[PDB]
Amino acid sequence: SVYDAAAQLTADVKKDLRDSWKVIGSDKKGNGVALMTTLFADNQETIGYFKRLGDVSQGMANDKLRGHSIGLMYALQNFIDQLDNPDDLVCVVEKFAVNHITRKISAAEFGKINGPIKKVLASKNFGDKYANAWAKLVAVVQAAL
Amino acid sequence: SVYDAAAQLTADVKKDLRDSWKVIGSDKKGNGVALMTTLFADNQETIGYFKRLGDVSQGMANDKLRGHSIGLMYALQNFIDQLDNPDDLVCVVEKFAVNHITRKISAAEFGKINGPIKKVLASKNFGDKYANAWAKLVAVVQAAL
Ligand code: HEM
Ligand code: HEM
């Protein structure tokens, strides 16, 4: 199932992912927080899963939120680094899904991250071409949920 | 406390951590799996916490173990990247501790990773000086458990 989704990560898709990550991943704290705050702004209902983080309206200043945001970027770093070996990408994606499945986060709910990713990419001037590439990577994770 | 433990990461400790990570982090899959297999070999009592992984003796051939091992190396990558800013190191360490606290992994239990780290370091020509530097980093996590 996840292997089939990984099959959509073509040579061109993997190239656009690496190129955009070279920029987005160069400031994990800044862009990681940008992603989370954008998710909360566009889909307020998702805050329900983050009660432990406390006052998420504090953004970057919220230590728990900042810690979570930085960590999120290392998961993506992991995914990007495994792009050339489907076997490793799949095992890393399935490992990642375990805790999210436990939290009862459906593929549909997880998909809400696509909007924020598109916006963050656009802030760095990476157009629709790149957003579509990232939507395909997210789809690999969705296949595991 | 975690804040006092992070203060123990002196100038040369941070430098030795970076110099050794430059080599160890070069092969996250290989060194990550070596780290886990060594832990299970030297402390068989910890295997119980990893029931979900299945037959851990299969090593690299165990997809779940490989997935977990690779991810473990990105957590260390995260810690190393935060050495410049104590405030960020602390929030990332506390974030990391959440799930380990939930699994009831105590500071003493976590500290068992020091042996495996020392052995992997030694396999790459990094002696006691480096093993002790890493013990200091591990001590920051222990303070959060
Ligand atoms: C690109 C997308 C995402 C990435 C890379 C990501 C990454 C991570 C990572 C690395 C962790 C820490 C390890 C763990 O506990 O599993 C985590 C925790 C978590 N994730 Fe995901 N995640 C993503 C999207 C989401 C979404 C869309 C939701 C919910 C709508 C979600 C909810 C959670 C929650 C509730 C936690 C625990 C937060 C805490 O209490 O500290 N994640 N995620
Ligand atoms: C250098 C030390 C270690 C690092 C960097 C590390 C890293 C990680 C990471 C990144 C995860 C995945 C996210 C999560 O679920 O929290 C994790 C999961 C886990 N860790 Fe730790 N860990 C370390 C040591 C330990 C030790 C010593 C134990 C137990 C004696 C432990 C037990 C667990 C367990 C049981 C899981 C879940 C495994 C699974 O079911 O897939 N960890 N750890």
Swiss-Prot record, chains A, B:
Keywords: Cytoplasm, Heme, Iron, Metal-binding, Oxygen transport, Transport. One of its GO terms (cellular component) is cytoplasm. It comes from the Eukaryota. The keyword Lipid biosynthesis does not apply. GO terms for molecular function: heme binding; identical protein binding; metal ion binding; oxygen binding; oxygen carrier activity. CDD domains: Mb-like (cd01040). Residues 8-145 form the Globin domain. Heme b binds at H100. It is found in: Cytoplasm. The keyword Transport applies. SUPFAM superfamilies: Globin-like (SSF46458). Its main location: cytoplasm. Gene3D superfamilies: Globins (1.10.490.10). Belongs to the globin family. PANTHER family: BLR2807 PROTEIN, GEO09476P1. Homodimer. This is Globin-1.
